[PDB]
Swiss-Prot record, chain A:
A Gene Ontology BP annotation from the UniProt entry: proteasome-mediated ubiquitin-dependent protein catabolic process
PANTHER family: 26S PROTEASOME NON-ATPASE REGULATORY SUBUNIT 13
Family, as annotated: Belongs to the proteasome subunit S11 family.
Gene for this chain: PSMD13
Domain PCI: 168-335
One of the record's GO molecular function terms: structural molecule activity
Keyword check for Zinc: no
Role summary: Component of the 26S proteasome, a multiprotein complex involved in the ATP-dependent degradation of ubiquitinated proteins. This complex plays a key role in the maintenance of protein homeostasis by removing misfolded or damaged proteins, which could impair cellular functions, and by removing proteins whose functions are no longer required. Therefore, the proteasome participates in numerous cellular processes, including cell cycle progression, apoptosis, or DNA damage repair.
Modified residue annotations for N6-acetyllysine: 295
Pfam family, one: PCI
Protein name: 26S proteasome non-ATPase regulatory subunit 13
Organism this protein belongs to: Homo sapiens
Curated annotation (Swiss-Prot), chain C:
UniProt-recorded name of the protein: 26S proteasome non-ATPase regulatory subunit 4
Keywords: Isopeptide bond, Phosphoprotein, Proteasome, Repeat, Ubl conjugation
Record family assignment: Belongs to the proteasome subunit S5A family.
Entry GO terms, CC: cytosol; nucleoplasm; nucleus; proteasome accessory complex; proteasome complex; proteasome regulatory particle, base subcomplex
UniProtKB/Swiss-Prot annotation, chain D:
Subunit structure: Component of the 19S proteasome regulatory particle complex. The 26S proteasome consists of a 20S core particle (CP) and two 19S regulatory subunits (RP). The regulatory particle is made of a lid composed of 9 subunits including PSMD7, a base containing 6 ATPases and few additional components. Within the complex, PSMD7 interacts with subunit PSMD4 through their respective MPN domain. Interacts with TRIM5.
Role description: Component of the 26S proteasome, a multiprotein complex involved in the ATP-dependent degradation of ubiquitinated proteins. This complex plays a key role in the maintenance of protein homeostasis by removing misfolded or damaged proteins, which could impair cellular functions, and by removing proteins whose functions are no longer required. Therefore, the proteasome participates in numerous cellular processes, including cell cycle progression, apoptosis, or DNA damage repair.
Note: Does not bind a metal ion.
Full protein name: 26S proteasome non-ATPase regulatory subunit 7
Homology family: Belongs to the peptidase M67A family.
Crosslinked residue numbers (Glycyl lysine isopeptide (Lys-Gly) (interchain with G-Cter in ubiquitin)): 50
Gene name of this polypeptide: PSMD7
Swiss-Prot record, chain F:
Disease: Deafness, cataract, impaired intellectual development, and polyneuropathy: An autosomal recessive disease characterized by early onset of deafness, cataract, severe developmental delay, and severely impaired intellectual development. Patients later develop polyneuropathy of the lower extremities, associated with depigmentation of the hair in that area.
Annotated family: Belongs to the AAA ATPase family.
Role description: Component of the 26S proteasome, a multiprotein complex involved in the ATP-dependent degradation of ubiquitinated proteins. This complex plays a key role in the maintenance of protein homeostasis by removing misfolded or damaged proteins, which could impair cellular functions, and by removing proteins whose functions are no longer required. Therefore, the proteasome participates in numerous cellular processes, including cell cycle progression, apoptosis, or DNA damage repair.
Subunit comment: Component of the 19S proteasome regulatory particle complex. The 26S proteasome consists of a 20S core particle (CP) and two 19S regulatory subunits (RP). The regulatory particle is made of a lid composed of 9 subunits, a base containing 6 ATPases including PSMC3 and few additional components. Interacts with PAAF1. (Microbial infection) Interacts with HIV-1 Tat.
Positions spanned in the full protein: 57 to 88 of 439
Amino acid sequence: VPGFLQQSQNSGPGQPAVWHRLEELYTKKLWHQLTLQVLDFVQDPCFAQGDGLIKLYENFISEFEHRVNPLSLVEIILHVVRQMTDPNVALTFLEKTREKVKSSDEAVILCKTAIGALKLNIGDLQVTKETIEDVEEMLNNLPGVTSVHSRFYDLSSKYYQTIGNHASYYKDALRFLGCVDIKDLPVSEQQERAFTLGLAGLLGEGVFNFGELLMHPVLESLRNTDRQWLIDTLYAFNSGNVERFQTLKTAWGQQPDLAANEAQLLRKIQLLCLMEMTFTRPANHRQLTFEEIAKSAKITVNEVELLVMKALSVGLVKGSIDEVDKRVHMTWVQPRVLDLQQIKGMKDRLEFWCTDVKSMEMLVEHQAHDILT
Amino acid sequence: AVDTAEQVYISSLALLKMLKHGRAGVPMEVMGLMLGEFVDDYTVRVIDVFAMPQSGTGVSVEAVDPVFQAKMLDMLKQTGRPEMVVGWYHSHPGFGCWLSGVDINTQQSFEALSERAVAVVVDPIQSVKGKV
Amino acid sequence: MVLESTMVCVDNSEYMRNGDFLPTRLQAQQDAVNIVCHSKTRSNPENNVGLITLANDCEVLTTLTPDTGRILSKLHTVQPKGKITFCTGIRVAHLALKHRQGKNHKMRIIAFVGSPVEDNEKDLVKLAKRLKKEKVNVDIINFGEEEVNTEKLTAFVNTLNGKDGTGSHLVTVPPGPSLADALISSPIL
Amino acid sequence: LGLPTEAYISVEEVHDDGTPTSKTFEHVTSEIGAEEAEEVGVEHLLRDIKDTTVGTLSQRITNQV
Amino acid sequence: KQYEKSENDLKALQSVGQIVGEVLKQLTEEKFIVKATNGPRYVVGCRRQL
Amino acid sequence: SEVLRVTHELQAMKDKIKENSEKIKVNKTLPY
Ligand SMILES: [Zn+2]
């Protein structure tokens, strides 16, 4: 049995420093220390063809695995299978491993997520959807893990090759970023992970711009450099100042998924323009005129009523529409994100309000002092 | 060796506990030992009171089951104070505020244990609205 | 007869799953128990015992009691998963001891330091600088993992004494998986 | 003010948007209630302020203040 | 299982029971005249949730 | 081992159930 490890000195990087010392690790019949060294070794840059030898080693050690913490065991099994990259072989191996460690341990979760990922590349409806629902439902009783949750979220988000699941797709990407603990990611991966979420949020039917993204860390730290037409688009959308110049370059950057939805994107930009124009008004003369909507929306005078009706129907404002007066009445229930400068106005309004309230309280107290007590 | 016009001071929490325990079991009769401090020869004060599970044929010498009496007074000192047992709940739902021969027989032993201990009688039925 | 109570810091670390003294290590922390204090009540039937874990910032599984069934029952379920904690672990035991009844009983903490700790250099200021004025006693058991002799841990007893102390001793039974006789005979206590 | 007590609950829902996990205690609305045979106790124990509709006009003005 | 069947056994040994009576009228939204099988009549209402 | 978790650990019903039946019995007042 051990002769395999003994003769496995070649065919792999870091031969002396890793294996020679490791030998003592199992000679002392020792344990999960060995597992930590194993994790380091598997993560090590390697084309990962000696998966058979590594796996025989793993089986030998895990015969009385016990000391092999199931979470690490599943992680290593998933890594080895992903390195082997044979479809049916990996699927069978995953089933065998998952069943063999079927305890109430919160690792069967990880195994099921890995299985969903493995099947995600083919037949993405029959088994994958049921598996993803099952993982969701069994993902309970321990919110503090934050890791199996990340894996399940990433599987779901990778599922994004599907039209219907979009808004939940943006939700999944956001949850990935939030519960991924630290970003702890290569800039290389982060670039794509942020561009994908940007496009998803731009294209969702209910998602408009979802502020707090701009200061949401996933984007800026990776996109501030270049290839950031998307961020200018995001700024324009969350502001809505038409600024449809950007689309001429955005289409060049991504004809697909952007040029294919010019009508939908422009409809959303018009709706957002209407909202932001309603928000910039100082809350006193909220009744605006179709001329204003047109000049701020490049749409026809006639179309303005339909645009406002659409806004109401989607549910971003709750005003009312009138014609004979050539005006419109708004009233809001959909508030958005803000910034420090915009908080100064709120602070000032609150201070004025507090001064007025104090004045009225003092007036009542002083005048009524005869009968108060 | 002689009584007087002496004042018994019951804490607000003590009164509240008396009333709640009495009303919880109005159809039956309840019993609850009292803890307090023997201030001086004319001032007996009770700070808090504790209830004894409704067992036996009723208010009698059975409410002092040592197994339960010792363990509460014990754990209670661990956090708070030992105020020595001074009195008892008792309760007469519809019988005014009288003391019967059995009640006298009971309180006789408590008097023996102490020298000036007191027996309370809290009526859980008549006392309502704004009456204590 | 016994001028002392008893609290124990039964390790729970993620590393505790290992073959180094027997089956799966901890299986031996459990080993003394049935004598880890069975011997301590082998004394006048008025001794007191305790239990404290040391993983995930450590909880308490037993409140000082001249009973052992509870401590054994909790010991049955001490699944090891997490990084060891100390200093805080010892202070929790110290407070628990302060809440001891029968003031005549002196204090004793038997530290089953197994998996490595992350304590800094001058932990003494809080680890031991108190036990004198508090007249406390602490015992250290090194479940292997004696990294470079763990002078860091030895320094705890070193801070102990100063003239007289150390309790029984900071006995580091050799990594040889002999048994608990080393925690049965060695402890003259 | 009128804060005699506040109620908190320990729900460890991880996060939304992009936040990390945390302790995330939460607040439950609270109000001081009553139970018959104890309302009588409190009534007697106070029996001095009696801040009921007594002196209704004055009390209404004080309430507005 | 014996301890389970005993815990509820002793716990239920607190309930006191009600008096069975038939309501007669509806005095107010919170005052309903109610009689009793024995024969005496009373005036009462819902508890806090009926 | 298995037994120590059952000899006196667990098996406590022989004390608790004994006591509990004591109070249910004691409350069996004479009248009915
Ligand atoms: Zn009586």
